[PDB]
Amino acid sequence: PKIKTVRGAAKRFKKTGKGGFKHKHANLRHILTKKATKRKRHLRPKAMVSKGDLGLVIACLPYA
Amino acid sequence: ARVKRGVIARARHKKILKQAKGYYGARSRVYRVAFQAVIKAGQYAYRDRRQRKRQFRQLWIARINAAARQNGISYSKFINGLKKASVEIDRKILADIAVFDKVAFTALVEKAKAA
Amino acid sequence: ELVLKDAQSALTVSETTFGRDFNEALVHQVVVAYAAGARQGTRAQKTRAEVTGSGKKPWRQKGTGRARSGSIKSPIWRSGGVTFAARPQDHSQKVNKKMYRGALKSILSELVRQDRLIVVEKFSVEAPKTKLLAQKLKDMALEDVLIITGELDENLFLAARNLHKVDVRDATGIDPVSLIAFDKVVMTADAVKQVEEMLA
Amino acid sequence: MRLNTLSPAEGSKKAGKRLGRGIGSGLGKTGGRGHKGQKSRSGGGVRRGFEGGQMPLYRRLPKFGFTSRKAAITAEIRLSDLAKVEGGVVDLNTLKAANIIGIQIEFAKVILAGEVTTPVTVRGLRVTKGARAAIEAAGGKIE
RNA sequence: UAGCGGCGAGCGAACGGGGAGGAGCCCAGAGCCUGAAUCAGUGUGUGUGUUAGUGGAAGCGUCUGGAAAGGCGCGCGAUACAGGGUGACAGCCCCGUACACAAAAAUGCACAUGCUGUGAGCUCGAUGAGUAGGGCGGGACACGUGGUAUCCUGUCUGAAUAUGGGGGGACCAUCCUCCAAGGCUAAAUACUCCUGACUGACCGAUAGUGAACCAGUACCGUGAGGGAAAGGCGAAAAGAACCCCGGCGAGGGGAGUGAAAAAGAACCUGAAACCGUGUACGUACAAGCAGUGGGAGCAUGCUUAGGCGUGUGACUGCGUACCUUUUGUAUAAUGGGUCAGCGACUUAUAUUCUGUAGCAAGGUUAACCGAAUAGGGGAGCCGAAGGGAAACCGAGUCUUAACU
Ligand SMILES: [Mg+2]
Ligand SMILES: [Mg+2]
Ligand SMILES: [Mg+2]
Ligand SMILES: [Mg+2]
Ligand SMILES: [Mg+2]
Ligand SMILES: [Mg+2]
Ligand SMILES: [Mg+2]
Ligand SMILES: [Mg+2]
Ligand SMILES: [Mg+2]
Ligand SMILES: [Mg+2]
Ligand SMILES: [Mg+2]
Ligand SMILES: [Mg+2]
Ligand SMILES: [Mg+2]
Ligand SMILES: [Mg+2]
Ligand SMILES: [Mg+2]
Ligand SMILES: [Mg+2]
Ligand SMILES: [Mg+2]
Ligand SMILES: [Mg+2]
Ligand SMILES: [Mg+2]
Ligand SMILES: [Mg+2]
Ligand SMILES: [Mg+2]
Ligand SMILES: [Mg+2]
Ligand SMILES: [Mg+2]
Ligand SMILES: [Mg+2]
Ligand SMILES: [Mg+2]
Ligand SMILES: [Mg+2]
Ligand SMILES: [Mg+2]
Ligand SMILES: [Mg+2]
Ligand SMILES: [Mg+2]
Ligand SMILES: [Mg+2]
Ligand SMILES: [Mg+2]
Ligand SMILES: [Mg+2]
Ligand SMILES: [Mg+2]
Ligand SMILES: [Mg+2]
Ligand SMILES: [Mg+2]
Ligand SMILES: [Mg+2]
Ligand SMILES: [Mg+2]
Ligand SMILES: [Mg+2]
Ligand SMILES: [Mg+2]
Ligand SMILES: [Mg+2]
Ligand SMILES: [Mg+2]
Ligand SMILES: [Mg+2]
Ligand SMILES: [Mg+2]
Ligand SMILES: [Mg+2]
Ligand SMILES: [Mg+2]
Ligand SMILES: [Mg+2]
Ligand SMILES: [Mg+2]
Ligand SMILES: [Mg+2]
Ligand SMILES: [Mg+2]
Ligand SMILES: [Mg+2]
Ligand SMILES: [Mg+2]
Ligand SMILES: [Mg+2]
Ligand SMILES: [Mg+2]
Ligand SMILES: [Mg+2]
Ligand SMILES: [Mg+2]
Ligand SMILES: [Mg+2]
Ligand SMILES: [Mg+2]
Ligand SMILES: [Mg+2]
Ligand SMILES: [Mg+2]
Ligand SMILES: [Mg+2]
Ligand SMILES: [Mg+2]
Ligand SMILES: [Mg+2]
Ligand SMILES: [Mg+2]
Ligand SMILES: [Mg+2]
Ligand SMILES: [Mg+2]
Ligand SMILES: [Mg+2]
Ligand SMILES: [Mg+2]
Ligand SMILES: [Mg+2]
Ligand SMILES: [Mg+2]
Ligand SMILES: [Mg+2]
Ligand SMILES: [Mg+2]
Ligand SMILES: [Mg+2]
Ligand SMILES: [Mg+2]
Ligand SMILES: [Mg+2]
Ligand SMILES: [Mg+2]
Ligand SMILES: [Mg+2]
Ligand SMILES: [Mg+2]
Ligand SMILES: [Mg+2]
Ligand SMILES: [Mg+2]
Ligand SMILES: [Mg+2]
Ligand SMILES: [Mg+2]
Ligand SMILES: [Mg+2]
Ligand SMILES: [Mg+2]
Ligand SMILES: [Mg+2]
Ligand SMILES: [Mg+2]
Ligand SMILES: [Mg+2]
Ligand SMILES: [Mg+2]
Ligand SMILES: [Mg+2]
Ligand SMILES: [Mg+2]
Ligand SMILES: [Mg+2]
Ligand SMILES: [Mg+2]
Ligand SMILES: [Mg+2]
Ligand SMILES: [Mg+2]
Ligand SMILES: [Mg+2]
Ligand SMILES: [Mg+2]
Ligand SMILES: [Mg+2]
Ligand SMILES: [Mg+2]
Ligand SMILES: [Mg+2]
Ligand SMILES: [Mg+2]
Ligand SMILES: [Mg+2]
Ligand SMILES: [Mg+2]
Ligand SMILES: [Mg+2]
Ligand SMILES: [Mg+2]
Ligand SMILES: [Mg+2]
Ligand SMILES: [Mg+2]
Ligand SMILES: [Mg+2]
Ligand SMILES: [Mg+2]
Ligand SMILES: [Mg+2]
Ligand SMILES: [Mg+2]
Ligand SMILES: [Mg+2]
Ligand SMILES: [Mg+2]
Ligand SMILES: [Mg+2]
Ligand SMILES: [Mg+2]
Ligand SMILES: [Mg+2]
Ligand SMILES: [Mg+2]
Ligand SMILES: [Mg+2]
Ligand SMILES: [Mg+2]
Ligand SMILES: [Mg+2]
Ligand SMILES: [Mg+2]
Ligand SMILES: [Mg+2]
Ligand SMILES: [Mg+2]
Ligand SMILES: [Mg+2]
Ligand SMILES: [Mg+2]
Ligand SMILES: [Mg+2]
Ligand SMILES: [Mg+2]
Ligand SMILES: [Mg+2]
Ligand SMILES: [Mg+2]
Ligand SMILES: [Mg+2]
Ligand SMILES: [Mg+2]
Ligand SMILES: [Mg+2]
Ligand SMILES: [Mg+2]
Ligand SMILES: [Mg+2]
Ligand SMILES: [Mg+2]
Ligand SMILES: [Mg+2]
Ligand SMILES: [Mg+2]
Ligand SMILES: [Mg+2]
Ligand SMILES: [Mg+2]
Ligand SMILES: [Mg+2]
Ligand SMILES: [Mg+2]
Ligand SMILES: [Mg+2]
Ligand SMILES: [Mg+2]
Ligand SMILES: [Mg+2]
Ligand SMILES: [Mg+2]
Ligand SMILES: [Mg+2]
C-alpha cells in the first residue's frame, strides 16, 4: 500500500523550491501584551527549518 | 528453491574432525568439542611460531655460555669481545661450532680475548 | 545493403536498425527480463498460521524443566512453520518500449556481423510435410534455425512443429531470446521489410 | 552473442545484505543493529516524528494557511510549449486537446519560459507582462 | 489530494477522465380494435457437445554388459521427437501422440416452428400521506454535531400534492437540474466442497496436506477436542529344495538362484554419534582446558648402498574451554550430554537515495483491445518556475505606506 502522510505535519510545513521547508513561528498565539513588539515582529514572518530537524519533517511527509 | 544442506555441513564437520585427529577423548571424535581444540591449536600455533624463535635463542645462548666458560670467559664478555673484533657470526652458529668443532671454537674465544 | 544466396539483389535496409553498436547490458537486461516473464511462480508453503493444529501451549510457561513453547506450529519445531512462507508471486518485470526496441535493434544488427542472419526471397515448402523441409535445409546448409516469415504459411508451420532445432515464427512475433538462441536466422524479404518498419 | 556469453554492466548488480551468516560476513550475529534496546527487536523502532516523548516539531509549531480551491483549477502554461496546438490559436479547449494542461482547468496563465517562433494569437487567456512582450515580438496579437 | 481527527494515533472522498460490460421496462386505467411483437411451456430443427470408443506411420547389424534403448555404422516415418513404459539413456519393441472417423440410450445447447395458454397500434385522463419536512435520541455517509448539507430511522409531530415538490454541502434569493413516498431486470463481478485436461526457476518422506503407508487410524481426553509414528529386496520371487548345529526351536554354516545375498525379507545407498576384535608405539614416582614449539627412542614404508614420509610421543619451554551478557568472566554468572536432520532480516505494494541501462526538455504509460512477454491505448503521472495564508502577480514575487 501507499505511504500515508502525517497530516498534522502537512498543515504546518510547506516545501520551498530548493527542498527545505517553511514554517510559521511559535510564541505568537496568546500572551502577547507582556511580550515586546520586537519579538512579535520577528516571529510574524515564515522561517526555514533547521538542518537537525529536517529528516524528521522529510519522513513525516514524503509527498511534497 | 529449497536447499537441503546435509551434504555441505558434513563435509565442513569432517574437515575439522580431520584436523583434530590425534587428540584425547571427545576432542577428536565430537565436532562441537573438536572445533574448540582445533581453534585453540591454531591460537597456540600462531603464538609458538614467535616463541620458537625466543626459546632457540636462549638454547643457543646457554650452549655458548656453557662452551665459553670451559675456556675461561663468560658469555657477556665473549659477545662483547666478538662485537669489538667486529665479528658478524650469530648465536645459531656459535652454538653449533661450540658443540661440533671445539678446536675451532677455541680460536673464537682467543680472538675475543684480544679485544 | 544485404546480399542474397540465390539472386544477389541489393536489399537496401536501414542503417540504424541493422547497423548499430552491440550494447551488451541492454540486451542482457531485456533477455533476463524476458526470461523472468516466462516464470509463472506458482508455489506456496504455509506459515505458522496456515499449518493445521491448535494454538494451545503444549506445556505451561514455567515449572517444567523444558524450553518455553507457545505452539506446535512454530517454525523452530518439527512438522509446521516455515518462517517466511512463499506466496504465489509475479516475477515478470517491466521493460521500456525504447529499450525492448533498442535491444532487438542491437541483437538483430549483430547477426549481420556474425552472418547468422540468412536473408532470403520466397521461402516456402510445397506441401504440409516435414520430410521436404528436412531435405531442403540440407541444400541450404542449416540445422538449428529460426525461420522468420511475413506471410505465415500453415504448410510451412505444420511442417516445422516436429523438427526440434527448427522454429517457425511470424515476423510480427520475433523475440529477444530466440534471435540469440538459434544458430542461424532465416528471414524472408517481406519479413525484413515488416521488422524494419516494426523496429524503425 | 550466445545465450551463455552475455553479461551485465559492471556496477549493475550488488548482491544484497545477508544478515546472520557467520563472522566472515562482517554483519552476522545482531545483523547490523547493535546490542538490545527497542530498535534491535523484531518490529522494533519508533513511529515517524517521535522524539522520545518530547513534543514533536510537527506539533510544537503552529499550523497556518488554508488550501485554495481556485488554485487547484488553474495552470501555469510555459511559453516554450505554446506553439504546439493549432497553428496560432490557443484559447482553452484547443490547448486542452494538445495535453499541455489538465481537463478541469478553467483559468490559465502564460509565463516567460523563453523561446517563441511562430505568430500565436493568444485569445481568452490571462498572459504575463514578460510573455506579452515576447508573444507580440514573435508576431501574434494577444486577445 | 480535499477533508475528518484528544486536528494525536490514525481514517480518507467525490467531480472529471480512461476501460470491461451494456438494456430496459411493468404497474396505482378508460376508445376503437382484438392473437400480429412478446415470451412460458408442450415442442418440434439441424448443428451438436457429452457420458462408451476405432484406426493410427517407420530398425536393423556389430561392441560392452546380467540385461541395450548404450557406443559404433548404415537406414527410414514425421500434420506423430507430448509423455510413459520396457532388465542402463528408445522417433521407429509396446501404450500413447498428431490426424480422420464414430452413439443403441440418456442428457446439457442454438434455430424453424403445431401451440392448453399471454395482449397489439392509438386516443382521453392517473401519477404511490401518517409520506416529505420538523423537534428529541441514535446511526450511515471519508466527514467524531462541528458552521454540517445528504440518507436511514426509535420517539413525538406534520405539508403541498405538477399554476406542486426534491436537489445544487449552514442559510437565503435568483438560475439549472430532477420528479421521492411501488415493483421487476441479463452482462461485466466474487467464489471452488467438487469433475476433467494441462503447466510449474513448487516439495521429494524431520520436506510436501495432519495423512505417499487401511490417518483423522493408533493413542490421549468424561467431552468439546487434540492427534501421531511408520516409504524404497530384485530386471524377474528365481523369497533360498537339500544337508550340518540347536529344543521335530531362535539363530547360524554350507549347497543352490541371481550380475550381485556384507541385494536373504530387521532386505538400494548405509554417514555420524555410540559400542567392539586384532595389529604398531606409548602408558603403574606422577599433578591441572590435555594442546602447542622443541625432541630421543621404537615401529613401519620407499628408492639407494644415503636419506625421507607415516604412526607413536619418553622428557621439556609456554599455555585457565566456547558462547552469551558485561566496566570487567578460567570464573564458583548464562546456555549446551553427544551426533544426525530441521531452525532466525523475508514477501507485496508505495516512497527517497546510490549504482547501472535506455531515451532526453522531455521521460513515460495504467487498466484495457490484444492470440498476446509484439503493437495499439498517453487517461494520467513526473519534470522543465517560483512567491504568497490567499486572491493575485510572475524571472521575479512576498513583506510593507514604500522599500537604497
Ligand atoms: Mg529570531
Ligand atoms: Mg506574515
Ligand atoms: Mg547529517
Ligand atoms: Mg506545488
Ligand atoms: Mg506538483
Ligand atoms: Mg529439491
Ligand atoms: Mg601424534
Ligand atoms: Mg599430525
Ligand atoms: Mg563425550
Ligand atoms: Mg574416530
Ligand atoms: Mg595467547
Ligand atoms: Mg625476537
Ligand atoms: Mg484459549
Ligand atoms: Mg520460563
Ligand atoms: Mg533440563
Ligand atoms: Mg521448520
Ligand atoms: Mg507430520
Ligand atoms: Mg509442514
Ligand atoms: Mg521484485
Ligand atoms: Mg542448439
Ligand atoms: Mg507437437
Ligand atoms: Mg529511430
Ligand atoms: Mg513508434
Ligand atoms: Mg566480474
Ligand atoms: Mg530479494
Ligand atoms: Mg564488525
Ligand atoms: Mg544499521
Ligand atoms: Mg543478543
Ligand atoms: Mg545496554
Ligand atoms: Mg541499540
Ligand atoms: Mg513479534
Ligand atoms: Mg512496527
Ligand atoms: Mg492528460
Ligand atoms: Mg490536545
Ligand atoms: Mg460535492
Ligand atoms: Mg455530494
Ligand atoms: Mg463519474
Ligand atoms: Mg450484446
Ligand atoms: Mg442483449
Ligand atoms: Mg453426436
Ligand atoms: Mg502406433
Ligand atoms: Mg540394438
Ligand atoms: Mg561410451
Ligand atoms: Mg554418428
Ligand atoms: Mg499434449
Ligand atoms: Mg519424450
Ligand atoms: Mg518415451
Ligand atoms: Mg511421471
Ligand atoms: Mg543398473
Ligand atoms: Mg536419449
Ligand atoms: Mg538417442
Ligand atoms: Mg537408435
Ligand atoms: Mg440417437
Ligand atoms: Mg443424435
Ligand atoms: Mg443399430
Ligand atoms: Mg432423468
Ligand atoms: Mg414512479
Ligand atoms: Mg428528503
Ligand atoms: Mg417544519
Ligand atoms: Mg434539518
Ligand atoms: Mg433542545
Ligand atoms: Mg435526526
Ligand atoms: Mg448498509
Ligand atoms: Mg466509531
Ligand atoms: Mg471543526
Ligand atoms: Mg424522515
Ligand atoms: Mg412544509
Ligand atoms: Mg392538512
Ligand atoms: Mg412532467
Ligand atoms: Mg396536465
Ligand atoms: Mg411558479
Ligand atoms: Mg438542501
Ligand atoms: Mg450552494
Ligand atoms: Mg416519473
Ligand atoms: Mg412520485
Ligand atoms: Mg421511481
Ligand atoms: Mg425512505
Ligand atoms: Mg439470462
Ligand atoms: Mg449482454
Ligand atoms: Mg482426450
Ligand atoms: Mg520445472
Ligand atoms: Mg528429487
Ligand atoms: Mg511428513
Ligand atoms: Mg531418506
Ligand atoms: Mg487433501
Ligand atoms: Mg482406516
Ligand atoms: Mg482410559
Ligand atoms: Mg476414547
Ligand atoms: Mg532356510
Ligand atoms: Mg541335524
Ligand atoms: Mg538335535
Ligand atoms: Mg520343545
Ligand atoms: Mg533368518
Ligand atoms: Mg531356520
Ligand atoms: Mg552361500
Ligand atoms: Mg550335498
Ligand atoms: Mg565349494
Ligand atoms: Mg551360481
Ligand atoms: Mg554367473
Ligand atoms: Mg558386494
Ligand atoms: Mg560391482
Ligand atoms: Mg552368502
Ligand atoms: Mg555370495
Ligand atoms: Mg565381499
Ligand atoms: Mg560374501
Ligand atoms: Mg537400484
Ligand atoms: Mg542395506
Ligand atoms: Mg558402516
Ligand atoms: Mg559407522
Ligand atoms: Mg595390543
Ligand atoms: Mg608392545
Ligand atoms: Mg611397553
Ligand atoms: Mg618420594
Ligand atoms: Mg614411569
Ligand atoms: Mg591427576
Ligand atoms: Mg602445567
Ligand atoms: Mg597433555
Ligand atoms: Mg602436539
Ligand atoms: Mg610439533
Ligand atoms: Mg624432530
Ligand atoms: Mg616435532
Ligand atoms: Mg626404526
Ligand atoms: Mg626398509
Ligand atoms: Mg611441561
Ligand atoms: Mg604455565
Ligand atoms: Mg548471558
Ligand atoms: Mg560492551
Ligand atoms: Mg552482571
Ligand atoms: Mg582472565
Ligand atoms: Mg560456567
Ligand atoms: Mg541472567
Ligand atoms: Mg548463553
Ligand atoms: Mg542445541
Ligand atoms: Mg547446563
Ligand atoms: Mg531487513
Ligand atoms: Mg552510455
Ligand atoms: Mg544516447
Ligand atoms: Mg523527442
Ligand atoms: Mg482500451
Ligand atoms: Mg499515476
Ligand atoms: Mg500533475
Ligand atoms: Mg507555483
Ligand atoms: Mg496611500
Ligand atoms: Mg510611499
Q: How close is the Cα of C95 to the center of ligand 19, in Å?
A: 14
The C-alpha angle C144, C146, C149, rounded to 5 degrees, equals 145
What are the two backbone dihedrals, phi and then psi, of residue B25, each rounded to the nearest 5 degrees? Answer: 70, -140
Pick C180's closest partner by Cβ from D2, D9, D12: D2
Provide the b/e sequence for C161-183 (b: ≥16 CB within 10 Å): eebeebbbbebeebebbbbbebe
Give SS3 for C146.
strand
- The range of the structural domain enclosing residue A51 comes to 1-64
Torsion of CA C124, C127, C130, C136, to 10 degrees: -50
CB C61 within 8 A of CB C68: yes
Beta bridge partners of C117: C185
Strand order in the sheet with D107-111: D74-78, D107-111, D126-127
CB D119 within 8 A of CB D88: yes
Q: Is the CB of D11 under 7 A from strand E?
A: yes
Beta bridge partners of B115: none
| Distance between the alpha carbon (CA) of C158 and the C1' atom of E105, Å | 39
CB C30 within 8 A of CB C101: no
Taken in order B105, B109, B114, B115, is the CA torsion positive or negative? positive
Helix-helix angle B31-71:B6-19, to 10 degrees: 20
Closest residue, chain D, to C178 (C-alpha): D3
Looking at chain D from residue 11 to 70, which residues have their Cβ under 8 Å from any Cβ of chain C? 12
Least Cα separation, residue D64 to chain A (angstroms): 6
Give SS3 for D60.
helix
| Distance between the alpha carbon (CA) of C58 and the C1' atom of E26, Å | 66
DSSP state of A8: H
* Paired sense of beta strands C117-120 and D126-127, if any: unpaired
Pick D62's closest partner by Cβ from A12, A57, A60: A12
**Alpha helix (H) residue ranges in chain C:** 15-18, 24-38, 97-114, 130-140, 154-158, 176-181, 189-199
Cβ separation of D6 and C28 shorter than 8 Å? Answer: yes
**Secondary element (H or E) of residue A13:** strand A13-15
Q: Residue by residue, what is the 3-state secondary structure of B52-69?
A: HHHHHHHHHHHHHHHHHH
**Secondary element (H or E) of residue A50:** none
Provide the b/e sequence for B39-74 (b: ≥16 CB within 10 Å): eeeeeeeeeeeeeeeeeeeeebeebbbebbeebebe
The C-alpha angle B102, B108, B111, rounded to 5 degrees, equals 145
Which cell numbers hold the place of C103?
535491444
Name residue C159's amino acid: A
Cβ separation of D1 and C29 shorter than 8 Å? Answer: no
Strand order in the sheet with C166-170: C117-120, C184-188, C145-149, C166-170
Say how far apart CA D110 and CA D112 lie, in whole Å. 7
Q: Could you tell me which residues come within 8 angstroms of residue A64 by beta carbon, excluding any fewer than 6 positions away? A: A15
| Distance between the alpha carbon (CA) of C113 and the C1' atom of E73, Å | 39
Which chains does B contact via 3+ CB–CB distances below 8 A?
none
Compute and round to an integer the Cα radius of gyration of chain B.
25
| CA-closest candidate to residue C41, choices C87, C83, C84, C82 | C87
Domain count of the fold of chain A: 1
Say how far apart CA A15 and CA C140 lie, in whole Å. 69
Say how far apart CA C45 and CA D47 lie, in whole Å. 32
Phi-psi region of A49 (alpha: psi -120 to 50; beta: other; left: phi over 0): beta
C181: which chain D residues are within 8 Å (Cβ-Cβ)? 3
Say how far apart CA D94 and CA D120 lie, in whole Å. 13
Provide the b/e sequence for C119-147 (b: ≥16 CB within 10 Å): bbeebebeeeeeeebbeebeeeebeebbb
**Resolution value, angstrom units:** 3.4
Closest residue, chain C, to D10 (C-alpha): C25
